[PDB]
Write a protein that binds this ligand. Sequence first.
Ligand SMILES: *[C@@H]1O[C@H](CO)[C@@H](O[C@@H]2O[C@H](CO)[C@@H](O[C@@H]3O[C@H](CO[C@H]4O[C@H](CO)[C@@H](O)[C@H](O[C@H]5O[C@H](CO)[C@@H](O)[C@H](O)[C@@H]5O[C@H]5O[C@H](CO)[C@@H](O)[C@H](O)[C@@H]5O)[C@@H]4O)[C@@H](O)[C@H](O[C@H]4O[C@H](CO)[C@@H](O)[C@H](O)[C@@H]4O[C@H]4O[C@H](CO)[C@@H](O)[C@H](O)[C@@H]4O)[C@@H]3O)[C@H](O)[C@H]2NC(C)=O)[C@H](O)[C@H]1NC(C)=O
Ligand SMILES: COCCOc1cc(C(=O)N2C[C@@H]3[C@H]4CN(C(=O)c5ccc6[nH]nnc6c5)C[C@H]4[C@@H]3C2)nc2ccccc12
Ligand SMILES: [Ca+2]
Ligand SMILES: [Cl-]
Ligand SMILES: [K+]
Ligand code: NA
Ligand SMILES: [Zn+2]
Length: 806
Amino acid sequence: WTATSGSCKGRCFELQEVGPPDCRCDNLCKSYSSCCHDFDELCLKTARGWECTKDRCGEVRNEENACHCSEDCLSRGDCCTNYQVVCKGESHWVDDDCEEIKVPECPAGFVRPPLIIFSVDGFRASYMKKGSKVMPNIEKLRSCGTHAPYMRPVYPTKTFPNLYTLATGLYPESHGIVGNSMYDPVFDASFHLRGREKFNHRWWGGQPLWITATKQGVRAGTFFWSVSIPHERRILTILQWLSLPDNERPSVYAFYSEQPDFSGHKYGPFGPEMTNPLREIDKTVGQLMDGLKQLRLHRCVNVIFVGDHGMEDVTCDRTEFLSNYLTNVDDITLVPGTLGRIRAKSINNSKYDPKTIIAALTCKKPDQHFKPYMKQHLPKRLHYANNRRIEDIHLLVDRRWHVARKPLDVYKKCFFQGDHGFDNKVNSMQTVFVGYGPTFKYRTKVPPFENIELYNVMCDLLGLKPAPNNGTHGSLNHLLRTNTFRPTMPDEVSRPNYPGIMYLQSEFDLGCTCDDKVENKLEELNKRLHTKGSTKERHLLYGRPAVLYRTSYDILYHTDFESGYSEIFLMPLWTSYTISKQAEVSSIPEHLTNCVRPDVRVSPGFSQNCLAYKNDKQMSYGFLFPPYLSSSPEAKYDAFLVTNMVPMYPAFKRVWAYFQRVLVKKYASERNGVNVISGPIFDYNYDGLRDTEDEIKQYVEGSSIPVPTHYYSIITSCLDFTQPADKCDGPLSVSSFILPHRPDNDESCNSSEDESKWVEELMKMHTARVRDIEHLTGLDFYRKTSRSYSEILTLKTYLHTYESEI
Ligand SMILES: *[C@@H]1O[C@H](CO)[C@@H](O[C@@H]2O[C@H](CO)[C@@H](O[C@@H]3O[C@H](CO[C@H]4O[C@H](CO)[C@@H](O)[C@H](O[C@H]5O[C@H](CO)[C@@H](O)[C@H](O)[C@@H]5O[C@H]5O[C@H](CO)[C@@H](O)[C@H](O)[C@@H]5O)[C@@H]4O)[C@@H](O)[C@H](O[C@H]4O[C@H](CO)[C@@H](O)[C@H](O)[C@@H]4O[C@H]4O[C@H](CO)[C@@H](O)[C@H](O)[C@@H]4O)[C@@H]3O)[C@H](O)[C@H]2NC(C)=O)[C@H](O)[C@H]1NC(C)=O
Ligand SMILES: COCCOc1cc(C(=O)N2C[C@@H]3[C@H]4CN(C(=O)c5ccc6[nH]nnc6c5)C[C@H]4[C@@H]3C2)nc2ccccc12
Ligand SMILES: [Ca+2]
Ligand SMILES: [Cl-]
Ligand SMILES: [K+]
Ligand code: NA
Ligand SMILES: [Zn+2]
């Protein structure tokens, strides 16, 4: 119940929401069917439009007008945004030359530059170039401020997940808004675009920026605008708030435009109909900037122009139907469209089986336009699994396509020509970032970055401490003139042991054999040197990784590689080696095919054993430092140490062997040497975070050897490829991956072919940031470089995407 009999008199767009059943006058009352009876008449005036004209200049104030052109309007804070232009001979902001804003130039009474977030729905990154002719205000913000060529959204690339990620710095699996539509089985409740359930606070996890500000004594304008409030009225409301007394005035504001997304769905991302929506958004930016200029705020406020996601060409005819794959299509519920999520239609149905559903959806049709996954097998870069609202079965839909349950859903639910929601690496899903103001840099281009990073920066702009989030704070310091955040490296928690030779070969009873008993102070002096770390500078280029949790581990040195060997997990946490452009690939000699050698620095009790591998009929083994890249026949023996061995399914060994034998040398040739760090990852609860030992669900049969869920590699070289990876004077370049350690290659539909036709494609799908590997391993990399820590933070957030040019 709402008693709409009260009045909005003097309350129009009031900042605090009054509670039912008293009627509301805030920018959301429409959405709740709760506004006071006179809200339209008082608060949504439209009379005479939005622009001053020559004849209105100096007019008698008529309070009925949508905005004013009378002499008192500036002090009242309610002139039309073009008042000073039409009536006082001023220029539009867009027509002014840009001039660096070295310091904030604010009216007295302002404690900090305000932040205005101007968010545009469905604004594809390429609109900045492709639409530049029709967007002069936006182009001036872009060229004069700080901009990225594009900003990467989160998955799924839908409206609510991305807006709330922008507000919180959290992945959707952590903030809880994991789609535009959701079922939460614990609540037994459904979140829908239409209706009231979505207003309930239980859906919205984390701490969005307006709450962070409010808790730290910084007032916030509301971020939500009812759809029927016109854009012009939104801008005028912001401008009026900016004229409030100091004690009442917010410091952070948001504007939201439903365009260009609205038209993009109807016309496709580059339909000729799209030019007008772009022009209209630019006019709205112009209104804001002229309004700020009138208020003497245009060299005071920081403005962020940001989108949530892009827009792809998708039509009704490009739909895959599950009814062409499944016999039992009526026993499932599908969340459909540019992603799919499947669960049982009824929890009482004991014949429902996820394994048989997945198998019926796997590589069934030659050009099939979606791929099924159990959520824990999705690429770890999507961070899309640790939430009960994410169904176990997921369909990753190819760009340009939809998935639906049955044909009748597409015609009894072509209309649309555009959509979004696909994998967040897809070029068409990228979106925009521009920052303009005293706190941002002048005429500066920054590389692409992820939208999870922005919350920390918004916090920096407002002097707020950010709530715990998934950004890496400091990685966007290069966007800022001032207010940078200068973190310190995390403290190493566990120091390594440095074991020397402590065991005789006969103490080991591992069931391992090696043909190595074939026999000089010239070469015996040299091998002692190698085991003590004499080549360590060549193979450990950025310092050893720090271990950020409590554990017991050893540093092991070798001619060709160095490792941090875990006594708890019985294998390396990391193995580091450098391969020059000149390095040669050799084979595993026939006499050495099955060779495994005890490591006389490491106790039998802290070693793997070969018998467990023999007895485990599903599990084989591989090596972290590859025997193919040994520097010499004699150095190759080091590669077969029991301490370099890790468990690997035969199907995965196909992947691993091709990476090690073919791809590493290929990267060293292309990149002028590479440094490789490889290792295992254990994430059995799919939370993106390193498992403790008691979380491990699978061991090599009969042993305490834990099976990794993933294998990673971090591949670093010099950004200036004229310098070799091991003699690099300046910035670095990195690509990394986190490969799922699976007992089949069902993910790769072409896996019956030679590895040269499918392996690198799989690896590209499982591209990762160094930071993703840090979370998964509790390791901290790049501890000793010549580089600033913020620059290293940016490097750790980099993602090599393999998409062509934007
Ligand atoms: C991205 O950044 C985020 C933010 O930093 C990272 O997420 C954090 O990770 C921490 C570890 O997983 C986690 O810390 C836990 O907090 C528990 C208390 O949590 C509540 O309070 C906080 C603070 O206000 C709040 O934010 C939480 O909000 C979550 O839950 C509600 C649902 O009720 C949601 O609305 C909200 O969206 C959010 O959900 C997300 O996180 C939860 C886990 O909290 C997931 O389950 C969801 O799927 C979703 O992803 C909560 O309201 C605290 O109780 C935990 O401590 C337990 O476990 C530890 C083990 O180390 C142990 O020491 C404790 O004793 C305790 O154990 C007991 O409980 C166990 C489980 O019930 C049980 O098994 C035991 O036997 C014991 O009884 C723990 O400290 C933190 O909550 C989240 N925060 C957020 C916002 O998600 C995230 O990791 C980053 N991602 C990456 C990849 O880096
Ligand atoms: C970002 O700065 C200001 C805007 O901030 C925010 C504004 C809004 C905010 O006010 N809205 C209005 C619209 C809601 C309903 N809706 C749709 O009808 C819709 C829109 C486009 C679609 N494309 N495909 N399907 C679609 C469905 C999605 C949400 C859009 C976001 N909500 C937010 C929720 C959380 C965090 C912030 C928010
Ligand atoms: Ca884990
Ligand atoms: Cl969704
Ligand atoms: K085996
Ligand atoms: Na296959
Ligand atoms: Zn949309």
